Amino acid sequence: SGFRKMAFPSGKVEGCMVQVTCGTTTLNGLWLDDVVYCPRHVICTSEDMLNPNYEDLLIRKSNHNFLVQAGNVQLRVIGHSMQNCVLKLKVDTANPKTPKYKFVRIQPGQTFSVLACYNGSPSGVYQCAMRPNFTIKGSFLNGSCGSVGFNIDYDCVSFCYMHHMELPTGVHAGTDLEGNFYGPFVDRQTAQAAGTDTTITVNVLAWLYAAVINGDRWFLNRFTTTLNDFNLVAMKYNYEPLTQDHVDILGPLSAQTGIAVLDMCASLKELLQNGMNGRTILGSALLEDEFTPFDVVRQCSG
Amino acid sequence: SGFRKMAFPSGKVEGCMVQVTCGTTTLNGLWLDDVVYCPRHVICTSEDMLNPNYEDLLIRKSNHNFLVQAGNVQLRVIGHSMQNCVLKLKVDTANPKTPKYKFVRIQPGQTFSVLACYNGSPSGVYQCAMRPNFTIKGSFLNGSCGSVGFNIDYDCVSFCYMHHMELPTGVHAGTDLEGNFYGPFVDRQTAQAAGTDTTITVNVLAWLYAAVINGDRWFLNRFTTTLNDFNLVAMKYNYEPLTQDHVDILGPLSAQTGIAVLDMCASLKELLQNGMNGRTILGSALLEDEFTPFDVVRQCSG
Ligand SMILES: *[C@H](O)[C@H](C[C@@H]1CCNC1=O)NC(=O)[C@H](CC(C)C)NC(=O)OCc1ccc2ccccc2c1
Ligand SMILES: *[C@H](O)[C@H](C[C@@H]1CCNC1=O)NC(=O)[C@H](CC(C)C)NC(=O)OCc1ccc2ccccc2c1
Ligand SMILES: [Mg+2]
Ligand SMILES: [Mg+2]
């Protein structure tokens, strides 16, 4: 028993992190087989940051402008190219620690593990949700660009996020591994803001099931509501509408606890309208929305 | 910016996890050089669990009673011995992935990363504090015994915890790597309870400094208190007394924010007496005590 924010073990990804230096800018790259992936803004200078023309900047570069360091071993760049917002540096050595992997673009509300790195060197691991406004609430300092987010399935690493920038509210933005930003953001140092966010309803419900599996029942009640009347409440408290796909995805959790989805919705409704009145749920005084139903099943086997 | 519960990267420890089977009981072992470390209760049977005599059980065992599996490769046990509550199995192959490591016994209030494993296979990573009552608030199912807690310093893995059992309140108990339990617990299936816990005061203060470093200032006030008057408040709200050693350990955080320790104490005092009134601190509606001052410095460099 117990329920913690849990990341995937990060060894398979640690073996892929390298340092990429271009001029005076150094950040992290991802070394898979014989290609290094990193944010293209490594080729920017401090004045180009306002509105750079990347095709121009890259035409002006040569393979020897890129210093790639894997541990101590300096890697030789033999080719370079740009795909959307990521730079691909072909190197002469295939990474012998390359895991089985996939690139995947995730949907809002999905979670992943972040391996925060500095100078090619892993610093820490933590769990993140892709917010409905396509930001993540990360922990990133200068030098962290190129850190990646990932899920692990059996032995296969699914990379879903590469870190590019911090927004004025302190949240974070980046791309999939093919270099397409999540959300409307762009990789230049301008005034970009996160749009208003919403709470991930299906995840809150998953986490309430995790509470029931772990002995927290004080919020349960006898009432069951309808999908329509629940969505009326969700709108009022800035929650995502609940869909039949979400109800269905919560099936296994519903069946393991014997609490129908729309039964749990009437508890959430009461929790939204009355607060917690000093009580807690899984050690939290707020309703938590960064656990997917998959996350709960994975950690709550028994 | 940002502040997350952050574990150490776990690759160095993943390379050491093995499966240990004895009869019908299987749990995890830690493979360092040519020795495997695991909880001694792997040699118990379902009836011996009430009050076993381990010296008797172990005398009755032979090297071939122990099946050690590293991935697919079965490892050959060439010797076995007992040190307090851990079993040491000498194997014929030294672990080629053995990191630089140390065994350390930590003090209450210190944190460490847990690599939860099942059948020798890492499942997830998370962060824990050793509570003042010598339990941890973990996430552990059956089969997780033998999972270890650790800190990483430069390249050196410091192992501080091995998992043995769950208590009736759902919290968790175990040993250092030399097999000495944290707290008064013993490794038999009897009625053992955690004593009453207390809040780790120096960690709450560290986390309030993390809040200030990250822009949360609504709880600050002009007042400064004395160590004596603050400790009076701490007693009333079940907080650990604040020592001069703790004040001194908070030095760097105090100097980076320009807020003297006893200035921050008067904010904590006001927060204890008035609650938060609907506001949050670093995304929490409660005062958090599982971040050491070292944890904050590590993550808040800027
Ligand atoms: C890449 O390493 C860096 C990651 C930022 C830096 C602070 N926290 C982060 O996540 N990304 C950038 O510097 C990015 C550059 C692109 C051309 C967009 N710009 C950016 O994030 O600007 C915002 C920002 C906020 C705080 C700091 C603090 C210290 C240094 C730089 C910044 C930049
Ligand atoms: C070792 O793998 C196991 C870890 C426990 C099991 C459930 N969560 C844990 O952390 N440890 C034990 O089974 C331990 C045996 C020793 C002889 C003390 N006993 C124990 O924890 O008893 C309490 C307990 C609570 C819940 C469950 C659920 C399912 C199976 C066993 C238990 C045991
Ligand atoms: Mg109900
Ligand atoms: Mg003050």
UniProtKB/Swiss-Prot annotation, chains A, B:
Effect upon mutating residue 205 to V: In strain: Zeta/P.2
**Positions of the catalytic residues:** 41, 145
Subcellular compartments = Host cytoplasm; Host Golgi apparatus; Host nucleus
Q: What is the effect of changing residue 142 to A?
A: Does not affect ability to cleave and inactivate human TRMT1
Query: How does this protein assemble?
Result: 3CL-PRO exists as monomer and homodimer. Only the homodimer shows catalytic activity. Interacts with host FBXO22; this interaction promotes the proteasomal degradation of nsp5.
Q: What is the effect of changing residue 49 to A?
A: Does not affect ability to cleave and inactivate human TRMT1
State the activity regulation. Inhibited by pyridone-containing alpha-ketoamides compounds 13a and 13b. In turn, alpha-ketoamide 13b (tert-butyl (1-((S)-1-(((S)-4-(benzylamino)-3,4-dioxo-1-((S)-2-oxopyrrolidin-3-yl)butan-2-yl)amino)-3-cyclopropyl-1-oxopropan-2-yl)-2-oxo-1,2-dihydropyridin-3-yl)carbamate) inhibits SARS-CoV-2 replication in human lung cells. Inhibited ex vivo by michael acceptor inhibitor N3. Inhibited ex vivo by compound 11a and 11b.
- Cytoplasmic topological domain residue ranges: 1-302
Q: Locate the Peptidase C30 domain: which residues?
A: 1-302
The free-text function statement in the UniProt record for this protein reads: Cleaves the C-terminus of replicase polyprotein at 11 sites. Recognizes substrates containing the core sequence [ILMVF]-Q-|-[SGACN]. Cleaves and inactivates human TRMT1, preventing tRNA guanine(26)-dimethylation of tRNAs. May cleave human NLRP1 in lung epithelial cells, thereby activating the NLRP1 inflammasome pathway. May cleave human GSDMD, triggering alternative GSDME-mediated epithelial cell death upon activation of the NLRP1 inflammasome, which may enhance the release interleukins 1B, 6, 16 and 18. Also able to bind an ADP-ribose-1''-phosphate (ADRP).
Cross-link Glycyl lysine isopeptide (Lys-Gly) (interchain with G-Cter in ubiquitin): where in chain? 5, 90
Q: Which reaction does it catalyse?
A: TSAVLQ-|-SGFRK-NH2 and SGVTFQ-|-GKFKK the two peptides corresponding to the two self-cleavage sites of the SARS 3C-like proteinase are the two most reactive peptide substrates. The enzyme exhibits a strong preference for substrates containing Gln at P1 position and Leu at P2 position
Mutagenesis / variant outcome for changing residue 132 to H? In strain: Omicron/BA.1, Omicron/BA.2, Omicron/BA.2.12.1, Omicron/BA.2.75, Omicron/BA.4, Omicron/BA.5, Omicron/BQ.1.1, Omicron/XBB.1.5, Omicron/EG.5.1
In Swiss-Prot or TrEMBL terms, this protein is called 3C-like proteinase nsp5
Q: Changing residue 145 to A: what effect?
A: Complete loss of 3C-like proteinase nsp5 cleavage
Q: Which domain of life is it from?
A: Viruses
